[model samples]
Target: STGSATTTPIDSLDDAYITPVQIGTPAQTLNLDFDTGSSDLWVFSSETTASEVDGQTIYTPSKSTTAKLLSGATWSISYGDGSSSSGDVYTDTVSVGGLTVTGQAVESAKKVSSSFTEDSTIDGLLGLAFSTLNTVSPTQQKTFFDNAKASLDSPVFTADLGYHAPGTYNFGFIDTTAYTGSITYTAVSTKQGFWEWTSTGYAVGSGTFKSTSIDGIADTGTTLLYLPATVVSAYWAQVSGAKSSSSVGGYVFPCSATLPSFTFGVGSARIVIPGDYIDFGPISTGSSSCFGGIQSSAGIGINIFGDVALKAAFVVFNGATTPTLGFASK
Candidate 1:
């Protein structure tokens, strides 16, 4: 499992941005969400005049000398957060790095909401999460992975988010600086194409916490990882009478103890997340006690392995060639 990174804004207008491989004879520029929870290439367009669109950068095909719009199609995407956007469909050539691919799929949102309108730095998201969560349909056939699959040096692609400054966004090949070796991958159940896996069990502080077999989906859409009650208790037990704080988000431990490392077994792969990652922020004004990165989701029912679990490993969304999902490290 890996942890997810928070996004910052990109201030430099002329800074280098990685382009996508074009989709058709003509090239089209699509702003995609590299979401780890879902797989889909959706963009906002000229047809959408929703007020929320004001904050998002609109894609003007006409501006591009080689841009082309799809004659008859409509596209819509509803995020897990309940934010939804819809617009007309278009086709264009896309280029990422030096490689160019044609007949690429694109979306132009006719409507947007405050959640999306707030982010001015990025116009859209290219979900590199999983193929199961793909938004491609009959009207829209190819995803970014499908368009660029042929040209990639390796059959696989890695998504690396760079931490440049307070407000900048970067996605493309994984940064070697993040890890020491190849990220061991674990095979997941292929039911709906969503990023999912079976957990034999979870261990904390070198002891078994929960032995009950559980299966759940891992997603970047959420910020924390949600587990069953048995699992949550098992984890909290390790930190020496760890209890939830008055704060209502996730879990928080006392300020003075050494949190042990967490090891999650995915199939036979043992992925360990160091303790520091768990305490994302300081709990109180000066108190050193850190908030537990892992939280309780027992009431939420659907266990979500969110961003906290994605940033740790090299993940892949495979749908174009193998029709299966894969994960590995650099």
Candidate 2:
């Protein structure tokens, strides 16, 4: 059977797309960020300290008869943005859309950093990455997708990320009506437990498409598009008032500046990122300066095609034998 879910953007930041997920025997619903960057299904739970709970929803395992502790099993995860969480594990019934997986590992957060605690809307993260990246120790955990893939008609999922709008995530099947034009497929390398792929080249605005090979991962959890320093510099140079600001961090430009669209090569498909989406809103409230969503990924080693880039196109994450990525205009 096919399962689909509508996702909503958070705080107009384009930071993440969250969908409802049910866990436990009685079905406790929580808003979970569907992250393709990491592999860990964790949630704010009763185990979390009261001080850290804030306005977030908590999963109470005691309310569910099917919930059982995994003994000494535990999990911990740290993100590139410095957010992190750690906790014990429990086996429970977890369902997304119309798909349900029994005895799925659910990490209950006992401790969370300010980054997570402050985000009152996000109750947890539903990882869609390869199961190999799961953080559960002693006994590694499997993602919800991995556990449910076996029963699916085909091992494939589609991400229809939207800009300041609603989108949908489809599982077990692809919805042809959601996208226009033929999808361009490219081979993906899951060696790092991510949907990593290489773009033939990129260009700033109407400039010549440089044949600079870029290796990166399509990360739904990340907020900005991170590329090589050289590529970032090239793009910023086109903006008259853009400059690297240590005070604001990354490249910042006047909010009124007309930014150029970015294009990346995937096989013969030229996926274009609209100019307006390049401006990541004001750096701070009431500030006329805005940060560039496209930044340098120098220290990170690998580039990241985050929401800023992914929302520009319709993406298909095909997990069949020999994983591949298909992209088309939305």
Candidate 3:
């Protein structure tokens, strides 16, 4: 069996993407962020701290006949803000798009931070990264994709994110109609639980493609593109008046500037992002300063091909015994 779900942008900026998922016997559907960066399928729940529940939907386990607690199992996910969402673990029937999985670990959120409470659109997160990174204690449970692999026609999934438009997350098979020409395949390393891969090289604008190996993770959960400072600086340098502003944080430039496009190589293929995409809108409404879609990953110490990059190409996560990544033009 295969599954396909449309992802809608939570905001006009495409800050994040979410998909509706069916959970429990009565089929309660919630908007979940399909994150390829983490491995915990957690949701806001009836038990979540009341104050933090502001506006977001919650998953009530007691209402589901199939829900069963994994006695002694718990999950805690920390964020950069020093706040976290932690809770008890349960197993239940969960469905996405058209595929279904029984006995899938469902982290029942007990505590939620303002970061989550502030964003009312996101009900929770559906992790697609390797289960090795699952936060469940005592015993880690397989991710939705991992548990659904056996029931799938093929062990693969594809992501196609759009800019303020509709996109789809497909499981088990690639959608030929979603992409153009051929896909460029690259090997993936899951040692760190991230869908990690290395880019052959990059070129700023129409400049010569610098032949360098840049290692990074393909994180659908992340909002912006992050690369080495060298690459970021090179890209930003092309725009006159672009600067690293401490006030706004990261690179920013004149909103009216004629920005140049960016290209990153996946094997022999070149995936280009229009400058309009990189403009990232104005820093402040009606302001001349605008933030950049591409920024330095030096602080994080790891490059990330987030939504900003994913929106430029069709990506396939081939989860065979040995996983591989395929990049194609869309």
Candidate 4:
């Protein structure tokens, strides 16, 4: 499965603590979303009262004497969807998978509600994407990797998301055993900070491209894959025959046969969207038209490859040196 954190648009609520990372332990977990949009290993502060953390993980600074708060620094974030959140800054010794990275900067929101959390399943987000965004100080405007680059055993991190089970999220070294042979790497483009590229075209159920290839962005924050009207309509045409009277909202095909393989050409990287992803739920209309994976955001422009698309490939964000992101197979 493809996974990596990138700086995509994100909405936030107040008091949502930054997810924590295990410094030298595994069970002593911290909250963090496997975000493909931004890269930061921040966590909500222990300063947050117990009542505020109803359905979330709270990082209590008192629990760890090593935690340090930035005296004058403030952290504010505005997501692509227009929601925002802000809080004070702090640094602590954080760890994930037994890898301890000291002096890790984190954001502790001052106010937030459970609904503001990315989801109930995710404790807090651990942004694995690459972006120009920096949680460090002005003088040290560095990505999370830059700050802890020296401590990591390997400069690379891999995300292994499971579709039916809790996906595997591995950091530090690449899983050489995972790949069949030499792993192909694509040098990231400098245009936008996120790991994004234009698609050559998209297909339905193995059909040819009905319209010009749309410029798509690979984002983790987005939940569904969005495409242009013409392309989306072409995909729906196949499913229309089965549920002749139904009109699905997202890209949900009626029968598996009608579902086409949606493909996108990322320069030389040909990414495929398996038909299973397009099968929407609420299979019966008047029920929940939000079936299948691909959906329509009529007002929003541009095609986005969200988590559905992400689960199919292995993605990597290279921020150890320059701001670069890589996509591969897991």
If both were scored by lDDT, which would come out higher, candidate 3 or candidate 4?
A: 3
> Please, what is the TM-score per model?
0.72, 0.98, 0.98, 0.75
* TM-score: model 3 vs. ground truth: 0.98
Best by lDDT: 3
Q: For model 1, how does the per-residue alpha-carbon lDDT over 1-330 read when each residue is reduced to its tens digit?
A: 112233432432111122233333344444444555655566655565666665555677766665566777766678766777767666676655445556666666677766777655456666555444555454545555556666655445554322222211222333456556555555566565565666656777677544556677766455556778677777777887477765545667776767776666665555565665465555656866657767777666567766555544455544344443334432
Encode model 3's per-residue lDDT on 224-300: one tens digit a residue: 99999999999999999999998898999998899898999999889998888786788888988999999999988
Give the Cα lDDT of each candidate: 0.56, 0.91, 0.92, 0.54
Task: Show model 1 residue runs off by greater than 4 Å.
Answer: 1-32, 44-50, 53-56, 129-138, 160-183, 209-212, 237-249, 252-259, 282-292, 297-302, 316-330
Can you tell me which runs of candidate 2 are displaced by over 4 Å? Answer: none
Clashes per candidate (backbone, < 3 Å): 54, 0, 0, 47
Report the Cα lDDT for candidate 3.
0.92
TM-score rank, highest first? 2, 3, 4, 1
Task: Give the per-residue lDDT digits (tens) of candidate 4, residues 118-181.
Answer: 4443445555555366444442234455555566666766654434334455566676665433
Q: How far is candidate 2 from the true structure (C-alpha RMSD, Å)?
A: 1.0
1 or 3, greater by lDDT: 3
Expressed as tens digits, the lDDT of each residue in 1-330 for candidate 2 is 668888899777777888999999899999999999999999999999889988888999999999999999999999989889999999999988888989999999999999889999999999999999999989998999888888887898889988889899888998889988989999899999999998889989999999868899999999899999999999999999999997777999999899999999888778899998888889989999998999999878789999998999889999888999998887
Worst 10 residues of 2 by lDDT: 9-18
RMSD of each: 6.2, 1.0, 1.1, 6.1
Which 10-residue window in model 3 sums to the lowest lDDT? 77-86
Task: Please report, as a residue range, the 10-residue window in candidate 1 with the lowest summed lDDT.
Answer: 12-21
